[PDB]
Symmetry: D2
Subunit: 216 residues, 4 copies
């Protein structure tokens, strides 16, 4: 087969941050069997965006994750039917973004229908003042609970004058057909904005994900 080594992405996200509506679309490609993808994103509504753009980058597929044969792929097995995922992003200052993404497949393109709502971000915080720099490398903790796969991560965004800005990830992954569940495992993540213009109306995003078994 369903997934070829080279696949494309088309997406469209509609959201709001602190009661600011905005919309972003993006197009990209990514070899999912090596866990790498890249995309180009354009703001279509709500520009210029008044919030730190990184709070969205991780909302922009777990099929781009290098899986070894030891661990069962929940994601590549869900296609061509696809899956849906929900997430709550809890930032240490109380800023909360909840997002959903319904991903489907069309030939060799994964199509995303993404929702995003971020509230309670403080006016003087590093998100509303765009003082973030980068997401650090990450390791996600995936475990099964009540028939579906879940994702838990606590990571941070690197801040401008030094220090880190921490966020707690709680992801629920739901397949659309009945699929085989995996054991407790991990995904190492590294997401980068490799190029952008001034107001982040055009952004180049890059991911790199691999799944592993812990300390061997």
């Amino acid at each position: 087969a369903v997934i070829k080594p080279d696949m494309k992405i088309k997406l469209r996200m509609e959201g709001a941050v602190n009661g600011h509506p905005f919309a972003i679309e993006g197009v990209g490609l990514g070899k999912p069997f090596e866990g790498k993808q890249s995309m180009d994103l354009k703001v279509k509504e709500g520009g210029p965006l008044p919030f730190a753009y990184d709070i969205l980058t991780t909302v922009f597929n777990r099929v781009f994750a290098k899986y070894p044969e030891n661990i069962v792929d929940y994601f590549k097995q869900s296609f061509p039917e696809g899956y849906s995922w929900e997430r709550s992003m809890n930032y240490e200052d109380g800023g909360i973004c909840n997002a959903t993404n319904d991903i489907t497949l069309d030939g060799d393109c994964y199509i995303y229908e993404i929702r995003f709502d971020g509230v309670n971000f403080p006016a003087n915080g590093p998100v509303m003042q765009k003082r973030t720099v980068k997401w650090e490398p990450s390791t996600e903790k995936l475990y099964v609970r009540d028939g579906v796969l879940k994702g838990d991560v606590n990571t941070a965004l690197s801040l401008e004058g030094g220090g880190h800005y921490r966020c707690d990830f709680k992801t629920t992954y739901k397949a659309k057909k009945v699929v085989q569940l995996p054991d407790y495992h991990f995904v190492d993540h590294h997401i980068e904005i490799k190029s952008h213009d001034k107001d982040y109306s055009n952004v180049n995003l890059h991911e790199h994900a691999e799944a592993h078994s812990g300390l061997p």
Copy 2:
């Protein structure tokens, strides 16, 4: 600016676990007595697959009996109005984000509401509609970074007994510069007075009073 009897109209667009819906309502209240009532119809996404109680608390702090010992942040924001955001954190990890931009037009308050719930479990009292009602509440309001905040710890009484807890974190933003208040409280009691089988029609009621704590 505020009549003793004020009208009310709203539209809420939202989703729960990625399942969209839309709700509108009209109603009126007495802001100087802290009471309101409204009638709500679902327009899209019906019949809703979640317990109606989770969004019923999103449906104006202006409806709150304020004494002169406490500064009213809400009636002071008017006629320009205010906006409020909220996180409703349920103890099983289901989290609801809500937004409300409130404006005034004559004697009717108009609300533009957003509502998003994620990570709610299939087997929870919200996906199985095991909620009965929200218990009486007391809100803790304090100033932070120029704006007013609201924190409560409350619960839903469940069908077979017991309670289901939610953490409220509310930020209230006025649209003009107004006088900030001291640490105070607002006592809440929200009841759904009437509804049809699939909660396509809902009659809401709320009584709200403010206090300075135990005197």
Copy 3:
């Protein structure tokens, strides 16, 4: 019956904050059916205390709470056998205090055996720099869960510049004998340090408490 209108309190609390041991003993008086109490506390070890004294004042009996006859009092009913209570105080900067109190009766005096452990308090926070002023009045939410009574409340400490420092209280109330459980209700709290010496080696504490069922 059992409990008289005027009862006395004598206690000893042993604890540590960020790994530094200390101990306090205290004696006091109160009227449980009028919900008001007062006691005098003396530091015995670890003095002078290098942390804000306000964090332990909420550990120093819900027997002192005015109950109406329409609400079932769980606390005065569990005497003369007594009860024990458990509690976690999560402070918004990540400092967390764990405390326990085993309460017994000896004639007309309640004896408290308190353990208290606070960890992860940051050096630059209002607790390590003793920038606290007061606890604001509180309303605790009491409900039964799994056979025991519990109490949740979020309060704040009044700071130097009018700011506020919020903490989440999670208390488990366990009686020693079998008593009738109450319905969902509230208890209103007001605790203030009504005197003290310079480094808080001597503290006069007061609390007034009444229980209610909310807005009728």
Copy 4:
């Protein structure tokens, strides 16, 4: 260095869980440059522990962690003076265990002074009903904040019937001499209970730990 390839450990921990005191001591050894260490623990007070022994195995030194040399060793740099660490474990059912560890060095053996207090564990939970199996492999994210080193991982316990029980770890590591601080990095952990008596009066503990920079 005066830290050798083979060092030994001796410790004593005094604590309580839900208000019931206990104390256990242990002796063991390890190799800090390969990240492995074993110990034997004997309960000395507290009867037979009515709680899952797994909750404390994680309180029983990050010097036993394989560091690559382009990551700065914060721990081996704090010796022979030693370091202290504080931590607050948060379990998803609301039970919280707080622990402190004052680590010292004496020749070739590390001495720990451990205090531990957990509270609010419910009777019907996996800790009070001894339904834990083991800790899963975990990935710890360590970062500097306000001059001190921090440790964030939230992980889970694999349960009896296949389920999972997650915990939020918040660790503060404070050295006792001024040492060179590191960049955001990781420590991979795998801790196991290798042998025990029927009531865990004797427990053999093992942990393997290696440090990494994340996904390159």
